[PDB]
Amino acid sequence: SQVFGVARIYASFNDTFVHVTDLSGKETIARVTGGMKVKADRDESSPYAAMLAAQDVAAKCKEVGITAVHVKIRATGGTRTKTPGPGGQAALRALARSGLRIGRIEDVTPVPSDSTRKKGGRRGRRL
Amino acid sequence: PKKRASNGRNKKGRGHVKPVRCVNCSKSIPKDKAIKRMAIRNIVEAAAVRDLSEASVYPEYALPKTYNKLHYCVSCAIHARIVRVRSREDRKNRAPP
Amino acid sequence: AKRTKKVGITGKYGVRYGSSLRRQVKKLEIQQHARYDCSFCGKKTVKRGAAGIWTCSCCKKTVAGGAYTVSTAAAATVRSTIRRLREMVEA
Amino acid sequence: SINQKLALVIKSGKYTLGYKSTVKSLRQGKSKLIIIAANTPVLRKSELEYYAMLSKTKVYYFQGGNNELGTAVGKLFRVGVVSILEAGDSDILTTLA
Amino acid sequence: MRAKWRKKRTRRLKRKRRKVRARSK
Amino acid sequence: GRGAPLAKVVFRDPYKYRLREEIFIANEGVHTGQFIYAGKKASLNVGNVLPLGSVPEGTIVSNVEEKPGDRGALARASGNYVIIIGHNPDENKTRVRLPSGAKKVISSDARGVIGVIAGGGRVDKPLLKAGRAFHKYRLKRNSWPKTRGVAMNPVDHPHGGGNHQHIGKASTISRGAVSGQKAGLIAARRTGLLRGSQKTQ
Amino acid sequence: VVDPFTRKEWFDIKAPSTFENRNVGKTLVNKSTGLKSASDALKGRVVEVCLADLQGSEDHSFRKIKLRVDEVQGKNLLTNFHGMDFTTDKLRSMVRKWQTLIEANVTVKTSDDYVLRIFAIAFTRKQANQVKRHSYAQSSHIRAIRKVISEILTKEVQGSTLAQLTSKLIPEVINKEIENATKDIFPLQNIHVRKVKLLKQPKFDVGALMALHG
RNA sequence: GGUGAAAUUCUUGGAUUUAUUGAAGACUAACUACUGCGAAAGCAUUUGCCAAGGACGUUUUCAUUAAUCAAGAACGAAAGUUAGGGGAUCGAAGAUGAUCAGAUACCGUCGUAGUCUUAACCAUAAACUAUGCCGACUAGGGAUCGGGUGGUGUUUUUUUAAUGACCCACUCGGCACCUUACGAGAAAUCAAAGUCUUUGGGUUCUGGGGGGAGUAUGGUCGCAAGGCUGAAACUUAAAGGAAUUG
Ligand SMILES: [Mg+2]
Ligand SMILES: [Mg+2]
Ligand SMILES: [Mg+2]
Ligand SMILES: [Mg+2]
Ligand SMILES: [Mg+2]
Ligand SMILES: [Mg+2]
Ligand SMILES: [Mg+2]
Ligand SMILES: [Mg+2]
Ligand SMILES: [Mg+2]
Ligand SMILES: [Mg+2]
Ligand SMILES: [Mg+2]
Ligand SMILES: [Mg+2]
Ligand SMILES: [Mg+2]
Ligand SMILES: [Mg+2]
Ligand SMILES: [Mg+2]
Ligand SMILES: [Mg+2]
Ligand SMILES: [Mg+2]
Ligand SMILES: [Mg+2]
Ligand SMILES: [Mg+2]
Ligand SMILES: [Mg+2]
Ligand SMILES: [Mg+2]
Ligand SMILES: [Mg+2]
Ligand SMILES: [Mg+2]
Ligand SMILES: [Mg+2]
Ligand SMILES: [Zn+2]
Ligand SMILES: [Zn+2]
């Protein structure tokens, strides 16, 4: 029905990323992350900032090619915390409530088979 | 004196297991001692469940949630997640709830 | 009886040059003077002269090789890597 | 296995070891089967091979060197070629070989 | 003080008495 | 005076009845009596000599031509070799990593011989006494032994001179320095103890 | 003051033969100019679209597909089969504790010469009457099944290109034949071909590429 | 980017992010469990080969061939050492950004050695069950691993089988857990830590108030760091265990 694209939301901690690209992926459009719409440098990840970024992100998305987008949510991944970031939920909620269509979304965050020993060493990060 | 017949945690007749890393403070810790939790949570939530199937294509879709294992360091499992602390005889109880 | 507790063949150098140099030499001298198994006649008649030259007592076959040993580790791994890559060209 | 086959022939059969003596066998046709060490030289091989087809003797090329074929025949020296004049209790003459 | 650093403390001292002594050989 | 064994390899002259004897450098494992194959269409075997285009990437070759037909240029010393890191059929080049580690691109019709050069590891053996060093250069040239420029008089050297034995000025000397100036570390881009992982990226 | 959108060309992705719909989506490249145009420049990209989007039925909701694009004509660029993936969520729920996981794979060619590697994944299930809470296998079981999976996986490939290979996978002919030889050893469950990757491909062959198009 | 918050830092070099594709070294996620195995250290992707082993089954064979052990020897986590290779990752040292009154640190960045492997050393770990080994006897319970036996037991249909998985009971031998306590302990607790003043099945090692001290000295091993062996003078009335209450 509509015209599809890929949301590909990388939500880490202490920042959150949202940009639509072509369904092939090689061509990208309109990024505007969460650290853009506010500078507190702490608040870079906040859900209220993520919504602010989804506002400028959905704006151009319907201002160029896309009436619809498939999303792929992603965490830090690799040897890091692997769990969802704060501004992940906010971005989807805010790009869905922008009227834009949603379908068939999955979790693409990188999963190792336990290698490349993690940082902070054996005794862990302690304070 | 010995405060646990499990000692730290369950390994018996093995003598070496292999350590995992804390998902929080990244401390090493034997898998037998790991204090593990399954994370079962929807990609969406209580708020966005409606806003999901509303503005979206497909008949209500699927809603394919996300699952991963968590490992904690004690000191970091004590700091937050299932620990509390328990009485002399409350300790022994292995009941999950 | 046993002659030397360590120095072995390196005993000729007497007290000189310092231990670590004698020990380092003793490895490779021992390595170069020894007789090796011939890849042809099967008897270990292969000895050395000069450097990279390894010849066989009978059979008169002479095979180029490492300086103080016959097969060098390097070539050893080159043997296999060609044994690999050559087979890409048939099957 | 193929060496197990030879350990039978050696104790239960009749044979000759070496080059010249199997050439004697090949010319008198006394050889049913000969066996060749993988490290034995090629010229000799093709000669052995020629005499063989003139004796209509079947030829199995043993994979291994003379050192091992010597260990194969239960002898402390080495052997480049074996000849079987009489197969004993062993089945080597009619088999995969 | 911690046994392990007290083990270090005596390990060092054994090493320095070693020096000082060998000077006398 | 060469640290590597050579190999005399005899062919037939295609244009005249005669035997023509070349001189190769012996790649480890080659031997008296072995058959050596030479050409674009040739097998991949230690000692045969092929154009670099005609061997797959990963190939380990010696004595390779810089220009195609200079009868060999790169990696002639004992133990040295070059590895093809792959080709560009269009304008038919081939990229390689020389013993220095440097990466050069040459013609695919540049010829090389499979394997590594023999006499490997000659350098791992301590030269021990002076004489061994001596006789080493006896067959090379008169380079040995070396007098420190700091040991001579000012006439004899830039480093020469002083009531104490010393260099007196930086021992790094520019590229544009002039004959009789350059003695030292010449055009050095850094100096001091090499700390940490070396090689390349 | 540029706005490349006033520059960028547009394009539409056409799907291959054995599927439901050939119509896929849109894309952005650039205008086709002399000296680095829009044609030979890219076009070789891939698209990940769940085949439940491609087939339209929801029984196929998992099982993603990568489509490499070969040629282009008249604002219409086809695509071919670059591989198949499993959805991350399905696998993650597919993996449950209290049981045995089994995986095997093999590298195999086809008649139209293509090299790939197909995987498999299976799980051990209890039985209708089964009292014990886990149901593991005997590890001789585990070795045997892989040999059987390998026995069966190789036969299906060299299956006349990827064409007949693609039409084999969609119905899960494979899955069932696995279950067949399997039951004589252990009951199991699930048993999907999971992922298959393409590490090598033949020359272009403009003629045979058009076999799936029309 | 990173954090409690910041900074050091990276960004006309399109940084972070996207895509295809490639290389290098390491690791074996999820499955992984009061689950398996090995003398311990230790051991988790596939396949092939090389040899090894327990438990079981046994109306097989030998026939006291055994039990435990100074001397002596095989192995031996990590770090560490020598000689190559490797050197992604993480990262003692070092240099830094911060925090502090100070902050040689905790947190952030850079990163040498190390981490990986081959050959050769080293021989220590809270190497722990802080609990020697062989034999016997003494008590109840449901789980589980491996082997076996028993069936007009279920499930797989092809035509019933045969198989395979599964269920029930029983029995050897495992890893464990539960409940009791006859009994034991100073107690915490222990199916051994029980069958000890009603004190004896065999056998090896170690300890004899706390410091001094695992120091001094000798001998021996090692390239080193260090390993084994290992005192005394003097000092001191407690040190210490488990539990009770504040
Ligand atoms: Mg804390
Ligand atoms: Mg305590
Ligand atoms: Mg443990
Ligand atoms: Mg241990
Ligand atoms: Mg002196
Ligand atoms: Mg001179
Ligand atoms: Mg000098
Ligand atoms: Mg000099
Ligand atoms: Mg000098
Ligand atoms: Mg002078
Ligand atoms: Mg001067
Ligand atoms: Mg000057
Ligand atoms: Mg001077
Ligand atoms: Mg000086
Ligand atoms: Mg695995
Ligand atoms: Mg490093
Ligand atoms: Mg520092
Ligand atoms: Mg400071
Ligand atoms: Mg000890
Ligand atoms: Mg312990
Ligand atoms: Mg009992
Ligand atoms: Mg039965
Ligand atoms: Mg009592
Ligand atoms: Mg005191
Ligand atoms: Zn932790
Ligand atoms: Zn010979």
Structural class label of chain D: alpha+beta
Q: What is the helix tally of chain D?
A: 4
The helix tally of chain A amounts to 2
Instruction: Please list the strands of the largest sheet of chain A in the order they lie side by side.
Output: 2-1-6-8
**Count of DSSP strands of chain A:** 8
Sheet-strand content of chain D, in percent, reads: 15-25%
Would you list the SSEs of chain A in sequence order as H and E?
A: EEEEHEEHEE
Query: Secondary-structure element order of chain D, as H and E?
Result: HEHEHEHE
Pfam families (chain D): Ribosomal_L7Ae
GO molecular function (chain D): pre-mRNA 5'-splice site binding; RNA binding; structural constituent of ribosome
Subcellular location (chain D): Cytoplasm
GO cellular component, one term (chain D): cytosolic large ribosomal subunit
Topology:
The structure is cut from a larger assembly and holds seven protein chains of seven kinds.
Chain C: H1 19-33, E1 46-49, E2 53-56, E3 62-64, H2 73-86
Antiparallel strand pairs in C: 1-2, 2-3
Chain D: H1 2-12, E1 14-17, H2 20-28, E2 33-36, H3 42-54, E3 58-61, H4 66-72, E4 81-86
Parallel strand pairs in D: 2-3
Antiparallel strand pairs in D: 1-4, 2-4
Chain G: E1 10-14, E2 23-28, E3 46-50, H1 51-55, E4 64-68, E5 76-77, E6 80-85, H2 88-94, E7 101-108, E8 115-123, H3 140-156, H4 163-169, H5 173-183, E9 196-200, H6 206-209
Parallel strand pairs in G: 1-5
Antiparallel strand pairs in G: 1-2, 3-4, 4-6, 6-9, 7-8, 8-9
Chain G binds one RNA strand of 246 nucleotides through strand 7 and helix 3.
Write up this protein.
With 127 residues, chain A is an alpha/beta fold. In chain A, 20% of the residues lie in helices and 15% in strands. The longest helix of chain A is centred in the middle third of the chain and has 15 residues, at 47-61. With 97 residues, chain B is α+β, with helices and mostly antiparallel strands. Chain B has one domain (1-97). Chain B is 18% helix and 19% strand. In chain B, the strands form two sheets. A two-stranded antiparallel ribbon of chain B has the order 1-2. In chain B, a hairpin with a 6-residue loop joins strand 1 (19-21) and strand 2 (28-30). In chain F, 4% of the residues lie in helices and 22% in strands. Chain F contains one helix and ten strands, in the order E-E-E-E-E-E-E-E-H-E-E. The chains are: A alpha/beta (127), B alpha+beta (97), C alpha+beta (91), D alpha+beta (97), E mainly alpha (25), F mainly beta (201), G alpha+beta (214). Chains in contact: A-B, A-G, B-G, C-D, C-F. The interface between C and F is large, with 34 and 37 residues. The complex binds magnesium ion (24 copies) and zinc ion (2 copies). The structure holds one RNA strand of 246 nucleotides.
